[PDB]
Design a protein around this ligand. Sequence first.
Ligand SMILES: OC[C@H]1O[C@H](O[C@H]2[C@H](O)[C@@H](O)[C@@H](O)O[C@@H]2CO)[C@H](O)[C@@H](O)[C@@H]1O
Length: 370
Amino acid sequence: KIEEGKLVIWINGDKGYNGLAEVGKKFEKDTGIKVTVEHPDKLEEKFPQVAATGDGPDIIFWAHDRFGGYAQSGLLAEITPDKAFQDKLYPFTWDAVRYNGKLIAYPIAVEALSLIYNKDLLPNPPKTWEEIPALDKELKAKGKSALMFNLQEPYFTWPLIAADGGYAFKYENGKYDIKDVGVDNAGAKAGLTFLVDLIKNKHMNADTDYSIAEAAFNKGETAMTINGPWAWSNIDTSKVNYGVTVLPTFKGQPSKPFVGVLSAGINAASPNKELAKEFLENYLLTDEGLEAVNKDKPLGAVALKSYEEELAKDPRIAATMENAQKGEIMPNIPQMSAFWYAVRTAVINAASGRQTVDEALKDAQTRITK
Ligand SMILES: OC[C@H]1O[C@H](O[C@H]2[C@H](O)[C@@H](O)[C@@H](O)O[C@@H]2CO)[C@H](O)[C@@H](O)[C@@H]1O
Protein backbone atom coordinates (compact mmCIF):
# COMPACT_ATOMS: atom_id res chain seq x y z
CA LYS A 1 0.00 0.00 0.00
CA ILE A 2 3.13 1.90 0.98
CA GLU A 3 2.91 5.67 0.93
CA GLU A 4 3.81 6.95 4.48
CA GLY A 5 2.45 9.93 6.30
CA LYS A 6 2.92 12.27 3.27
CA LEU A 7 0.97 12.93 -0.04
CA VAL A 8 2.19 11.99 -3.64
CA ILE A 9 0.08 13.37 -6.52
CA TRP A 10 0.14 12.33 -10.16
CA ILE A 11 -1.23 14.79 -12.78
CA ASN A 12 -0.71 14.95 -16.59
CA GLY A 13 2.16 16.95 -17.96
CA ASP A 14 -0.11 19.32 -19.87
CA LYS A 15 -1.81 20.62 -16.63
CA GLY A 16 -0.55 23.23 -14.15
CA TYR A 17 1.47 20.92 -11.93
CA ASN A 18 3.56 23.90 -10.72
CA GLY A 19 0.34 25.67 -9.55
CA LEU A 20 -0.55 22.36 -7.87
CA ALA A 21 2.90 22.21 -6.21
CA GLU A 22 2.33 25.84 -4.83
CA VAL A 23 -0.84 24.48 -3.30
CA GLY A 24 0.94 21.48 -1.73
CA LYS A 25 3.34 24.01 -0.22
CA LYS A 26 0.83 25.83 1.89
CA PHE A 27 -0.70 22.46 2.79
CA GLU A 28 2.57 21.46 4.29
CA LYS A 29 3.58 24.81 5.75
CA ASP A 30 0.19 24.57 7.53
CA THR A 31 0.34 20.96 8.38
CA GLY A 32 3.71 19.28 8.34
CA ILE A 33 2.62 16.84 5.63
CA LYS A 34 4.79 17.48 2.64
CA VAL A 35 3.21 17.08 -0.77
CA THR A 36 5.17 15.73 -3.79
CA VAL A 37 3.69 16.46 -7.33
CA GLU A 38 4.67 14.21 -10.24
CA HIS A 39 3.68 14.02 -13.87
CA PRO A 40 4.75 10.63 -15.22
CA ASP A 41 4.25 9.92 -18.93
CA LYS A 42 1.27 7.56 -19.62
CA LEU A 43 0.19 7.97 -16.03
CA GLU A 44 -3.33 6.95 -16.91
CA GLU A 45 -1.82 3.70 -18.01
CA LYS A 46 0.85 3.51 -15.35
CA PHE A 47 -1.67 3.99 -12.51
CA PRO A 48 -3.62 0.71 -12.81
CA GLN A 49 -0.34 -1.08 -13.11
CA VAL A 50 1.37 0.19 -9.91
CA ALA A 51 -1.88 0.73 -7.92
CA ALA A 52 -2.85 -2.84 -8.59
CA THR A 53 0.23 -3.79 -6.51
CA GLY A 54 -1.06 -1.60 -3.71
CA ASP A 55 1.36 1.28 -4.50
CA GLY A 56 1.29 4.45 -6.80
CA PRO A 57 0.22 8.01 -5.82
CA ASP A 58 -2.06 8.82 -2.89
CA ILE A 59 -4.03 10.97 -5.43
CA ILE A 60 -4.52 10.66 -9.19
CA PHE A 61 -5.85 13.27 -11.58
CA TRP A 62 -7.28 12.38 -14.99
CA ALA A 63 -10.43 13.15 -17.12
CA HIS A 64 -13.36 11.08 -15.65
CA ASP A 65 -13.63 8.62 -18.64
CA ARG A 66 -10.77 6.49 -17.11
CA PHE A 67 -12.36 6.34 -13.56
CA GLY A 68 -15.11 3.63 -14.14
CA GLY A 69 -12.35 1.18 -15.08
CA TYR A 70 -10.17 2.07 -12.10
CA ALA A 71 -13.17 1.65 -9.77
CA GLN A 72 -14.18 -1.75 -11.28
CA SER A 73 -10.64 -3.04 -10.76
CA GLY A 74 -11.05 -1.76 -7.16
CA LEU A 75 -8.28 1.03 -7.26
CA LEU A 76 -10.15 3.90 -5.85
CA ALA A 77 -11.72 4.73 -2.53
CA GLU A 78 -15.34 5.88 -2.27
CA ILE A 79 -15.34 9.50 -1.22
CA THR A 80 -18.00 11.09 1.01
CA PRO A 81 -18.51 14.84 0.90
CA ASP A 82 -21.57 16.04 2.75
CA LYS A 83 -24.36 17.80 0.99
CA ALA A 84 -22.81 21.04 2.14
CA PHE A 85 -19.56 20.34 0.40
CA GLN A 86 -21.44 18.74 -2.45
CA ASP A 87 -23.47 21.96 -2.76
CA LYS A 88 -20.45 24.01 -3.75
CA LEU A 89 -20.12 22.12 -7.06
CA TYR A 90 -22.20 21.91 -10.12
CA PRO A 91 -24.22 18.68 -9.83
CA PHE A 92 -23.72 17.49 -13.38
CA THR A 93 -20.01 17.34 -12.31
CA TRP A 94 -20.73 14.86 -9.40
CA ASP A 95 -22.67 12.65 -11.85
CA ALA A 96 -19.58 12.33 -14.02
CA VAL A 97 -17.73 10.74 -11.06
CA ARG A 98 -20.36 8.26 -9.99
CA TYR A 99 -19.77 4.65 -10.71
CA ASN A 100 -22.59 2.24 -9.80
CA GLY A 101 -24.13 5.08 -7.77
CA LYS A 102 -21.02 5.68 -5.48
CA LEU A 103 -18.81 8.77 -5.82
CA ILE A 104 -15.23 7.74 -6.74
CA ALA A 105 -13.60 11.11 -7.26
CA TYR A 106 -13.74 14.89 -6.80
CA PRO A 107 -14.59 16.79 -10.02
CA ILE A 108 -12.22 19.73 -10.64
CA ALA A 109 -12.93 21.27 -14.08
CA VAL A 110 -14.87 20.87 -17.32
CA GLU A 111 -12.71 20.49 -20.41
CA ALA A 112 -13.88 20.95 -24.06
CA LEU A 113 -11.75 21.58 -27.18
CA SER A 114 -12.17 24.97 -29.04
CA LEU A 115 -11.04 26.45 -32.36
CA ILE A 116 -8.06 28.81 -31.62
CA TYR A 117 -7.21 31.18 -34.48
CA ASN A 118 -4.53 33.80 -35.19
CA LYS A 119 -6.43 37.11 -35.41
CA ASP A 120 -3.63 38.56 -37.47
CA LEU A 121 -3.70 35.86 -40.23
CA LEU A 122 -7.53 35.39 -39.85
CA PRO A 123 -9.53 38.15 -38.21
CA ASN A 124 -12.70 36.07 -38.96
CA PRO A 125 -12.61 32.31 -38.27
CA PRO A 126 -14.25 29.95 -40.75
CA LYS A 127 -17.74 28.77 -39.71
CA THR A 128 -17.49 25.50 -41.62
CA TRP A 129 -15.07 22.63 -41.96
CA GLU A 130 -15.91 22.69 -45.68
CA GLU A 131 -14.32 26.09 -46.39
CA ILE A 132 -11.03 25.05 -44.88
CA PRO A 133 -9.48 23.58 -48.05
CA ALA A 134 -10.01 26.85 -49.99
CA LEU A 135 -8.68 28.77 -47.09
CA ASP A 136 -5.43 26.70 -46.97
CA LYS A 137 -4.98 27.22 -50.72
CA GLU A 138 -4.90 31.03 -50.10
CA LEU A 139 -2.60 31.00 -47.04
CA LYS A 140 -0.19 28.52 -48.61
CA ALA A 141 0.50 30.96 -51.44
CA LYS A 142 1.75 33.22 -48.62
CA GLY A 143 3.95 30.49 -47.05
CA LYS A 144 1.33 29.64 -44.24
CA SER A 145 -1.38 26.95 -43.56
CA ALA A 146 -4.93 27.11 -42.44
CA LEU A 147 -4.92 24.47 -39.65
CA MET A 148 -2.77 22.09 -37.73
CA PHE A 149 -3.79 19.99 -34.68
CA ASN A 150 -2.78 16.77 -32.98
CA LEU A 151 -3.77 13.83 -35.25
CA GLN A 152 -2.11 11.21 -33.11
CA GLU A 153 -4.80 11.45 -30.23
CA PRO A 154 -8.37 10.44 -31.15
CA TYR A 155 -9.65 12.99 -28.67
CA PHE A 156 -8.73 15.82 -31.17
CA THR A 157 -10.36 14.22 -34.14
CA TRP A 158 -13.58 12.91 -32.41
CA PRO A 159 -15.50 16.22 -32.78
CA LEU A 160 -15.51 15.88 -36.56
CA ILE A 161 -16.30 12.13 -36.46
CA ALA A 162 -19.17 12.66 -34.13
CA ALA A 163 -20.58 15.80 -35.97
CA ASP A 164 -22.70 14.01 -38.60
CA GLY A 165 -23.58 11.07 -36.24
CA GLY A 166 -20.58 8.97 -35.02
CA TYR A 167 -21.00 7.91 -31.37
CA ALA A 168 -19.21 5.79 -28.75
CA PHE A 169 -21.93 3.80 -26.79
CA LYS A 170 -25.64 4.37 -27.12
CA TYR A 171 -27.11 5.66 -23.87
CA GLU A 172 -30.40 3.71 -23.57
CA ASN A 173 -32.74 3.69 -20.49
CA GLY A 174 -30.42 4.71 -17.70
CA LYS A 175 -27.39 2.98 -19.09
CA TYR A 176 -24.89 2.53 -21.86
CA ASP A 177 -25.38 -0.33 -24.26
CA ILE A 178 -21.89 -1.77 -24.75
CA LYS A 179 -22.96 -3.63 -27.86
CA ASP A 180 -24.44 -0.54 -29.56
CA VAL A 181 -21.40 1.41 -30.94
CA GLY A 182 -21.45 4.20 -33.63
CA VAL A 183 -17.92 4.18 -34.82
CA ASP A 184 -18.68 2.69 -38.18
CA ASN A 185 -22.01 4.29 -39.06
CA ALA A 186 -22.62 6.71 -41.98
CA GLY A 187 -21.79 9.89 -39.91
CA ALA A 188 -18.59 8.51 -38.56
CA LYS A 189 -17.53 7.40 -42.09
CA ALA A 190 -18.36 10.90 -43.59
CA GLY A 191 -16.29 12.58 -40.83
CA LEU A 192 -13.15 10.48 -41.15
CA THR A 193 -13.34 10.64 -44.98
CA PHE A 194 -13.33 14.43 -44.82
CA LEU A 195 -10.26 14.32 -42.59
CA VAL A 196 -8.35 11.84 -44.83
CA ASP A 197 -9.23 14.02 -47.84
CA LEU A 198 -7.54 17.00 -46.08
CA ILE A 199 -4.39 14.99 -45.90
CA LYS A 200 -4.73 13.41 -49.33
CA ASN A 201 -4.92 16.89 -50.83
CA LYS A 202 -1.99 18.21 -48.84
CA HIS A 203 -3.85 20.54 -46.51
CA MET A 204 -2.66 18.55 -43.54
CA ASN A 205 -0.03 15.99 -42.73
CA ALA A 206 -0.61 12.60 -41.26
CA ASP A 207 2.27 12.99 -38.85
CA THR A 208 1.17 16.15 -36.98
CA ASP A 209 1.37 15.62 -33.29
CA TYR A 210 0.83 17.82 -30.19
CA SER A 211 4.25 19.48 -30.31
CA ILE A 212 4.38 20.05 -34.10
CA ALA A 213 0.83 21.63 -33.94
CA GLU A 214 1.67 23.68 -30.92
CA ALA A 215 5.00 25.04 -32.32
CA ALA A 216 3.35 25.75 -35.63
CA PHE A 217 0.61 27.99 -34.21
CA ASN A 218 2.81 29.60 -31.57
CA LYS A 219 5.40 30.62 -34.26
CA GLY A 220 2.78 32.08 -36.55
CA GLU A 221 2.96 29.49 -39.27
CA THR A 222 -0.58 28.10 -39.13
CA ALA A 223 -3.69 30.26 -38.82
CA MET A 224 -5.74 27.84 -36.50
CA THR A 225 -5.29 24.90 -34.13
CA ILE A 226 -7.78 22.90 -31.99
CA ASN A 227 -6.83 22.53 -28.32
CA GLY A 228 -8.11 22.71 -24.68
CA PRO A 229 -7.76 25.40 -22.02
CA TRP A 230 -4.39 24.06 -20.80
CA ALA A 231 -2.65 25.25 -24.11
CA TRP A 232 -3.65 28.96 -23.61
CA SER A 233 -0.63 29.64 -21.39
CA ASN A 234 2.02 28.99 -24.00
CA ILE A 235 0.05 30.93 -26.57
CA ASP A 236 -0.02 33.94 -24.24
CA THR A 237 3.66 33.61 -23.78
CA SER A 238 4.32 33.64 -27.51
CA LYS A 239 2.11 36.80 -27.68
CA VAL A 240 0.28 35.54 -30.88
CA ASN A 241 -2.97 37.64 -31.26
CA TYR A 242 -5.47 34.74 -30.84
CA GLY A 243 -9.17 34.21 -30.39
CA VAL A 244 -10.90 31.09 -28.96
CA THR A 245 -14.26 30.17 -30.52
CA VAL A 246 -16.81 27.51 -31.41
CA LEU A 247 -15.56 24.62 -33.59
CA PRO A 248 -16.71 24.67 -37.25
CA THR A 249 -19.77 22.74 -38.43
CA PHE A 250 -19.62 19.79 -40.70
CA LYS A 251 -22.64 19.07 -43.02
CA GLY A 252 -24.35 21.86 -41.16
CA GLN A 253 -24.13 20.12 -37.75
CA PRO A 254 -22.00 21.30 -34.88
CA SER A 255 -18.60 19.58 -34.25
CA LYS A 256 -19.27 17.61 -30.97
CA PRO A 257 -16.30 17.33 -28.65
CA PHE A 258 -16.29 14.60 -26.01
CA VAL A 259 -16.31 16.57 -22.71
CA GLY A 260 -13.97 15.59 -19.87
CA VAL A 261 -14.36 16.43 -16.19
CA LEU A 262 -10.78 16.74 -14.79
CA SER A 263 -11.00 14.58 -11.62
CA ALA A 264 -8.91 13.67 -8.48
CA GLY A 265 -9.19 10.12 -7.12
CA ILE A 266 -7.79 8.55 -3.95
CA ASN A 267 -5.74 5.41 -4.20
CA ALA A 268 -7.65 2.69 -2.36
CA ALA A 269 -4.10 1.61 -1.30
CA SER A 270 -3.27 4.91 0.54
CA PRO A 271 -2.81 5.20 4.29
CA ASN A 272 -3.31 8.95 3.83
CA LYS A 273 -7.05 9.08 2.86
CA GLU A 274 -7.99 11.61 5.51
CA LEU A 275 -5.02 13.86 4.62
CA ALA A 276 -5.99 13.46 0.96
CA LYS A 277 -9.57 14.44 1.68
CA GLU A 278 -8.44 17.49 3.77
CA PHE A 279 -6.23 18.67 0.85
CA LEU A 280 -8.79 18.25 -1.85
CA GLU A 281 -11.87 19.63 -0.07
CA ASN A 282 -10.16 22.30 2.05
CA TYR A 283 -7.01 23.40 0.04
CA LEU A 284 -7.50 22.71 -3.69
CA LEU A 285 -11.22 22.84 -4.01
CA THR A 286 -11.39 26.50 -2.88
CA ASP A 287 -11.28 29.79 -4.94
CA GLU A 288 -7.69 30.22 -3.85
CA GLY A 289 -6.42 26.74 -4.63
CA LEU A 290 -8.11 26.65 -8.04
CA GLU A 291 -6.61 29.99 -8.86
CA ALA A 292 -2.97 28.98 -8.09
CA VAL A 293 -3.48 26.06 -10.50
CA ASN A 294 -5.34 28.12 -13.20
CA LYS A 295 -2.55 30.82 -13.28
CA ASP A 296 -0.10 28.00 -14.13
CA LYS A 297 -2.19 26.27 -16.91
CA PRO A 298 -5.85 27.33 -17.30
CA LEU A 299 -8.37 24.72 -16.15
CA GLY A 300 -11.38 25.53 -18.37
CA ALA A 301 -14.81 25.88 -16.68
CA VAL A 302 -14.33 24.87 -12.92
CA ALA A 303 -16.84 22.74 -11.02
CA LEU A 304 -16.63 25.14 -7.98
CA LYS A 305 -19.50 27.51 -8.46
CA SER A 306 -17.90 30.46 -6.66
CA TYR A 307 -14.71 30.47 -8.78
CA GLU A 308 -16.60 29.56 -11.97
CA GLU A 309 -18.55 32.70 -11.38
CA GLU A 310 -15.39 34.81 -11.69
CA LEU A 311 -14.07 32.65 -14.56
CA ALA A 312 -16.32 33.33 -17.29
CA LYS A 313 -17.04 36.45 -18.34
CA ASP A 314 -13.79 35.37 -19.99
CA PRO A 315 -14.69 34.95 -23.65
CA ARG A 316 -12.25 31.92 -23.86
CA ILE A 317 -14.25 30.29 -21.09
CA ALA A 318 -17.53 31.22 -22.75
CA ALA A 319 -16.38 29.50 -25.92
CA THR A 320 -15.26 26.47 -23.92
CA MET A 321 -18.80 26.26 -22.50
CA GLU A 322 -20.41 26.62 -25.88
CA ASN A 323 -18.36 23.76 -27.44
CA ALA A 324 -19.00 21.75 -24.28
CA GLN A 325 -22.79 22.33 -24.69
CA LYS A 326 -22.64 21.01 -28.29
CA GLY A 327 -20.60 18.08 -27.20
CA GLU A 328 -21.28 15.13 -24.94
CA ILE A 329 -19.84 14.23 -21.60
CA MET A 330 -17.82 10.99 -21.96
CA PRO A 331 -19.04 7.73 -20.47
CA ASN A 332 -16.78 6.51 -17.54
CA ILE A 333 -17.64 2.78 -18.14
CA PRO A 334 -14.65 0.31 -18.13
CA GLN A 335 -15.15 -0.12 -21.86
CA MET A 336 -13.84 3.51 -22.56
CA SER A 337 -10.28 2.20 -22.77
CA ALA A 338 -11.16 -0.35 -25.56
CA PHE A 339 -13.05 2.34 -27.45
CA TRP A 340 -10.06 4.72 -27.32
CA TYR A 341 -7.40 2.26 -28.43
CA ALA A 342 -9.62 0.98 -31.25
CA VAL A 343 -10.40 4.52 -32.48
CA ARG A 344 -6.73 5.52 -32.12
CA THR A 345 -5.59 2.76 -34.46
CA ALA A 346 -8.40 3.40 -36.94
CA VAL A 347 -7.56 7.08 -37.51
CA ILE A 348 -3.85 6.62 -37.75
CA ASN A 349 -4.23 3.71 -40.18
CA ALA A 350 -6.74 5.72 -42.24
CA ALA A 351 -4.77 9.01 -42.20
CA SER A 352 -1.51 7.18 -43.10
CA GLY A 353 -3.41 5.47 -46.00
CA ARG A 354 -2.63 2.00 -44.60
CA GLN A 355 -6.39 1.24 -44.61
CA THR A 356 -9.40 2.84 -46.24
CA VAL A 357 -11.92 4.57 -43.97
CA ASP A 358 -14.50 1.75 -44.40
CA GLU A 359 -11.92 -0.91 -43.51
CA ALA A 360 -10.54 1.13 -40.57
CA LEU A 361 -13.91 1.85 -38.94
CA LYS A 362 -15.12 -1.60 -39.44
CA ASP A 363 -12.18 -3.11 -37.66
CA ALA A 364 -12.61 -0.66 -34.89
CA GLN A 365 -16.28 -1.57 -34.55
CA THR A 366 -15.36 -5.28 -34.30
CA ARG A 367 -12.60 -4.65 -31.89
CA ILE A 368 -14.91 -2.68 -29.56
CA THR A 369 -17.90 -4.99 -29.54
CA LYS A 370 -16.00 -8.34 -29.36
O1 LIG B 1 -7.06 10.58 -27.22
C1 LIG B 1 -7.71 9.67 -26.22
C2 LIG B 1 -7.62 10.24 -24.83
O2 LIG B 1 -8.62 11.28 -24.77
C3 LIG B 1 -8.83 11.89 -23.57
O3 LIG B 1 -7.60 12.40 -23.05
C4 LIG B 1 -7.44 13.85 -23.10
C5 LIG B 1 -7.60 14.39 -21.71
O4 LIG B 1 -8.98 14.23 -21.32
C6 LIG B 1 -7.32 15.87 -21.69
O5 LIG B 1 -7.33 16.30 -20.35
C7 LIG B 1 -5.96 16.17 -22.31
O6 LIG B 1 -4.98 15.86 -21.43
O7 LIG B 1 -5.56 15.38 -23.35
C8 LIG B 1 -5.96 14.05 -23.56
C9 LIG B 1 -5.78 13.67 -25.05
O8 LIG B 1 -4.35 13.68 -25.20
C10 LIG B 1 -9.21 10.88 -22.47
O9 LIG B 1 -9.41 11.52 -21.19
C11 LIG B 1 -8.19 9.77 -22.39
O10 LIG B 1 -8.57 8.70 -21.51
C12 LIG B 1 -8.00 9.17 -23.83
O11 LIG B 1 -7.00 8.14 -23.84
